[PDB]
Amino acid sequence: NRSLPDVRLEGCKTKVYPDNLPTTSVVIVFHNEAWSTLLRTVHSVINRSPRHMIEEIVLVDDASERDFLKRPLESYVKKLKVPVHVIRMEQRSGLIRARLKGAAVSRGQVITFLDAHCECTAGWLEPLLARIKHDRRTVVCPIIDVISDDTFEYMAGSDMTYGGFNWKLNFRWYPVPQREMDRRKGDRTLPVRTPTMAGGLFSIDRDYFQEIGTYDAGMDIWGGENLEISFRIWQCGGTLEIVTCSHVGHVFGQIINKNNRRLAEVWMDEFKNFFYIISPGVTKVDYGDISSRLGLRRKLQCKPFSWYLENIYPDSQIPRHYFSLGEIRNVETNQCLDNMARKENEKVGIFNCHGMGGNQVFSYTANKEIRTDDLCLDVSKLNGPVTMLKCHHLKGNQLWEYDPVKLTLQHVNSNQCLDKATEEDSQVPSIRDCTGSRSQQWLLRNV
């Protein structure tokens, strides 16, 4: 234990929570974690938490190998305020397996999951439990602050950042949008409805966890965190929030795709194609049996992935409605726009349509944007270069009007059209005054 400053939002410091919040059993799994780091977490939990709110602390050793973790730990553990137990996985298991085990061992009404490398803030627990007490079907996440791995210095995380995800099914941090600000009328001290969760840290009602099917043990153990429990909670009646008054620190192929297929085949209905279409060959990855989970979904009678995009994640990166999902082919040159695997702020290229999806996959969305995953085609000056920028959902320079009859794609702000590449810059589309050539005619086809 060391100290920190109060990183909570001014208003949080005054809030009073009802009496008799439930008791929680923090569950932490570890693997060869350094001694100091592991105990800094343990101590932060006891010192920063009101004793009558903590049941016990369960430390799940995931088949470590380091000497100090064995008897010294147990020794050191049994001697202190809060009861701390040390469960041991016989032969390497994985986070899911370890959390499942340490959870079946806990006895608190609400289970809190943390990593072996975290540090709790002042006032972190009360707001979490208070939320769950208001509604048992609410899963809660504290704001995740940053601890350096080198210096270990502290940097608080913002209440204006929440969980989303991209076409590749990767979890990602995204800015809280207006709707969430309008809904809370500006009071940032009110919890945020996050479309997804980092998976790292969260608290949940003991009985609610079991009720929505805990975790999918069919996923391979070297996988890790997933969007899976996030889609599950929402589509199946629950509510997932980031309690902005709670802060907690954290120090910062085939396997990955197996879990993506498992969660995508089970929850994303037809939107799973956004992931498949841009990952040619991921279809050869064997993802195991999902019958059980498919059973669970029908048992709980969860709502469609579409219900989730329009109600819970309107500012999603995967479009709920789209005019096309495929290649954008120039009718004159028969070349296709393609991201060339480049990153945000980079020039979108153009090359002969190979007709094999992937990097030549684009979507002209209902929001009139020409996007590929989380990037959108952006123009800022006449004849300027058309680059791929992070999609802000505000149109403007990322607004393109398509004419399905005339086949044009004009950039609204500049008042020009898109056509074949010019010379000297032979490998990129261009934006020029609208002529009417077959060169400014594009075919937005659907796979």
Ligand X SMILES: *[C@@H]1O[C@H](CO)[C@@H](O[C@@H]2O[C@H](CO)[C@@H](O[C@@H]3O[C@H](CO)[C@@H](O)[C@H](O)[C@@H]3O)[C@H](O)[C@H]2NC(C)=O)[C@H](O)[C@H]1NC(C)=O
The binding site for Ca ion (CB under 5 A) comprises 213, 402
Provide the phi-psi class of 230: left if phi over 0, else alpha when psi is between -120 and 50, else beta.
alpha
Give the pairing type, strands 110-115 and 161-165: unpaired
Q: Which among 23, 209, 175 is positioned nearest to 108, based on CA atoms?
A: 23
Q: Is 267 annotated as a binding residue?
A: no
In the complex, the smallest distance separating the C-beta of residue 306 from ligand X, rounded to whole angstroms, is 8
Residue 324 binding target from ligand X, Ca ion, Mn ion, none, CB below 5 to 8 Å by type: ligand X
Q: Measuring CA to CA, how many Å separate 2 from each of 48, 122, 256?
A: 11, 12, 36
In the complex, the smallest distance separating the C-beta of residue 135 from ligand X, rounded to whole angstroms, is 32
Residue 323 interacts with ligand X (CB under 6 A): yes or no: yes
Q: What does the alpha-carbon distance between residue 315 and residue 318 come to, in Å, rounded to a whole number?
A: 9
Task: Work out which of 171, 287, 322, 400 binds ligand X, going by CB under 6 A.
Answer: 322
Q: Helix 228-235 vs helix 254-267: angle between axes, to the nearest 10 degrees? A: 10
Helices H, strands E: what count in the chain? Answer: 11, 26
Confirm if 29 and 99 have CB atoms less than 8 A apart.
yes
Q: Is 234 annotated as a binding residue?
A: no
Long-range contacts of 435-438 (CB under 8 A, 24+ apart): 437/332, 438/331, 438/332
User: Quick one: which H or E segment has residue 101?
Assistant: helix 95-105
Residue 274 interacts with ligand X (CB under 6 A): yes or no: no
- Using the contact rule CB under 6 A, the part of the chain among 7-15, 50-58, 183-191, 320-328 near ligand X is 320-328
**Interaction residues for Mn ion, span 78-137 (CB under 5 A):** 115
Beta strands, E only, 40-157? 54-61, 84-88, 110-115, 118-120, 138-147, 154-155
In the complex, the smallest distance separating the C-beta of residue 139 from Mn ion, rounded to whole angstroms, is 18
Distance of CA 254 to the CA centre of its chain: 20
Task: Work out which of 324, 363, 387, 440 binds ligand X, going by CB under 6 A.
Answer: 324
Residue nearest to Mn ion (CB): 115
DSSP-assigned beta bridge partners for residue 411: 400
In the complex, the smallest distance separating the C-beta of residue 309 from ligand X, rounded to whole angstroms, is 10
Residues shown for the chain: 447
Q: Is 442 annotated as a binding residue?
A: no
Residue 321 interacts with ligand X (CB under 6 A): yes or no: yes
Q: Is 207 annotated as a binding residue?
A: no
Task: Work out which of 29, 325, 336, 350 binds ligand X, going by CB under 6 A.
Answer: 325
- In the complex with ligand X, the residue whose CB is nearer, 231 or 322, is 322
Residue 246 interacts with ligand X (CB under 6 A): yes or no: no
Q: What does the alpha-carbon distance between residue 225 and residue 358 come to, in Å, rounded to a whole number?
A: 25
Residue 446 interacts with ligand X (CB under 6 A): yes or no: yes
User: Binding string, 212-231, against ligand X, x = CB under 6 A?
Assistant: --------------------
Residue 446 binding target from Ca ion, ligand X, Mn ion, none, CB below 5 to 8 Å by type: ligand X
Q: What does the alpha-carbon distance between residue 111 and residue 23 come to, in Å, rounded to a whole number?
A: 9
Residue 317 interacts with ligand X (CB under 6 A): yes or no: no
User: Quick one: which H or E segment has residue 1?
Assistant: none
In the complex, the smallest distance separating the C-beta of residue 116 from Ca ion, rounded to whole angstroms, is 27
Residue type at 375 in one-letter notation: L
Distance of CA 235 to the CA centre of its chain: 15
- Using the contact rule CB under 6 A, the part of the chain among 322-330, 372-380, 409-417, 425-433 near ligand X is 322-330
Residue 213 binding target from ligand X, Mn ion, Ca ion, none, CB below 5 to 8 Å by type: Ca ion
Q: Is 250 annotated as a binding residue?
A: yes
In the complex, the smallest distance separating the C-beta of residue 405 from Ca ion, rounded to whole angstroms, is 9
Tokens coding 196: 């997804």
Tokens coding 102: 């340490």
Residue 55 interacts with Mn ion (CB under 5 A): yes or no: no
Q: Measuring CA to CA, how many Å separate 77 from each of 116, 214, 401?
A: 14, 28, 64
- In the complex with Ca ion, the residue whose CB is nearer, 154 or 402, is 402
Residue 218 binding target from Ca ion, Mn ion, ligand X, none, CB below 5 to 8 Å by type: none
Distance of CA 431 to the CA centre of its chain: 35
- In the complex with Ca ion, the residue whose CB is nearer, 16 or 405, is 405
Residue 78 binding target from Mn ion, ligand X, Ca ion, none, CB below 5 to 8 Å by type: none
Cβ contacts of 146 within 8 Å, gap of 6 or more: 154, 155, 156, 157, 249, 250, 252
Residue 325 binding target from Ca ion, ligand X, Mn ion, none, CB below 5 to 8 Å by type: ligand X
Residue type at 171 in one-letter notation: F
Residue 184 sits at φ, ψ, to 5 deg, of -95, 5
In the complex, the smallest distance separating the C-beta of residue 445 from ligand X, rounded to whole angstroms, is 7
Q: Is 92 annotated as a binding residue?
A: yes
Residue 115 binding target from ligand X, Mn ion, Ca ion, none, CB below 5 to 8 Å by type: Mn ion
Residues annotated in a binding site for Mn(2+): 115, 117, 250
Q: Where does this chain bind ligand X (CB under 6 A)?
A: 321-325, 446
Residues annotated in a binding site for substrate: 62, 92, 222
Residues annotated in a binding site: 62, 92, 115, 117, 222, 250
Q: Where does this chain bind Mn ion (CB under 5 A)?
A: 115
